[PDB]
Amino acid sequence: QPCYLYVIGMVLTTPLPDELNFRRRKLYPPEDTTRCFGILTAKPIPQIPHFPVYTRSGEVTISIELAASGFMLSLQMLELITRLHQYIFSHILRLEKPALAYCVLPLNVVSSTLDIDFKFMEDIEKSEARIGIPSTKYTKETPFVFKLEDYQDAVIIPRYRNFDQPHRFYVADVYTDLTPLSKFPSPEYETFAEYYKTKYNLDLTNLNQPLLDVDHTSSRLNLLTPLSSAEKRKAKWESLQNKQILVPELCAIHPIPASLWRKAVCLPSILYRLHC
RNA sequence: GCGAAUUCGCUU
RNA sequence: GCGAAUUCGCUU
């Protein structure tokens, strides 16, 4: 049975105006990075009007466009694609009901020409940070090395708490004027290094390291449109989450880039709309 | 988000 | 179970 491949076209048509940028984030046009998502199906998707999703960066216009049709795929590749599809909703979004068609998969350019990113899928399956927390072996003789490039489009997790279910953060800023020896926000500890040593008994091998600003990755399920004591408490906690300053040495980098993660959170809205 | 305490509304 | 109010704990 032949396949149809669609691209989930995303463009940021109305960036979030300053008066609405409460969390004071950078805005990230999806169109700025080539890797995106597509849909692979056995039957054609009826033409559907362009529609908005309202993301953190502003209003994004979604277009579902045909990329390829009439081709075949081997059982091996379909299995790989299926696994990644399942990975997206169970491990990235942590969602039991994808649509609040058949396989979502990553596309990338080969040259400005979108096709199935098999390499990326394989990289995910080989990653030691694929599911939870990868092992490390930092010592004085083999210390942690900070490479800025690895933090530019990164999602990170703390390696030292919550291991059944790690909190994933976007790296929002790299604070090059700070180190683990900078003064700690709470007065019960003098430094970041002391905090982590006293609380978790963690030793640092690198004391020249920049520190990181973060932005939680959590997103509401329905983004198709742009209160309570409970919502207050939740917003307060999110504010504190976002005030956290993390030590790169103490975090692991997730194999899914930040730019793709931002597109992932739109998927349920889009699949819901398609099934309507 | 994960938990806790106190108080109040909806049923006959 | 469906809701609401007030207060407190967990992150740096």
Describe the structure.
The protein has 276 residues and is α+β, with helices and mostly antiparallel strands. The chain has 2 domains: 1-131 and 217-226 and 254-276, no CATH class; 132-216 and 227-253, paz domain (Beta Complex). Helix content is 26%, strand content 25%. It contains 7 helices and 11 strands. The strands form 2 sheets. The chain has a 6-stranded antiparallel sheet with strand order 3-4-1-2-5-6. Strands 10-9-8-7-11 form a 5-stranded antiparallel sheet. Helix 1 crosses helix 2 (118-126). The two termini are 25 Å apart. The chain binds a RNA duplex (12 and 12 nucleotides) through helix 5 and strand 10. It is found in: Cytoplasm; Cytoplasm, Perinuclear region. The modification Phosphoserine is found at residue 229. Residues 119-255 form the PAZ domain.
Task: Using brief descriptors, characterize the structure shown.
about 280 residues, alpha+beta, paz domain, 2 domains, six-stranded antiparallel β-sheet, five-stranded antiparallel β-sheet, 7 helices, about 25% strand, RNA-binding, Endoribonuclease Dicer
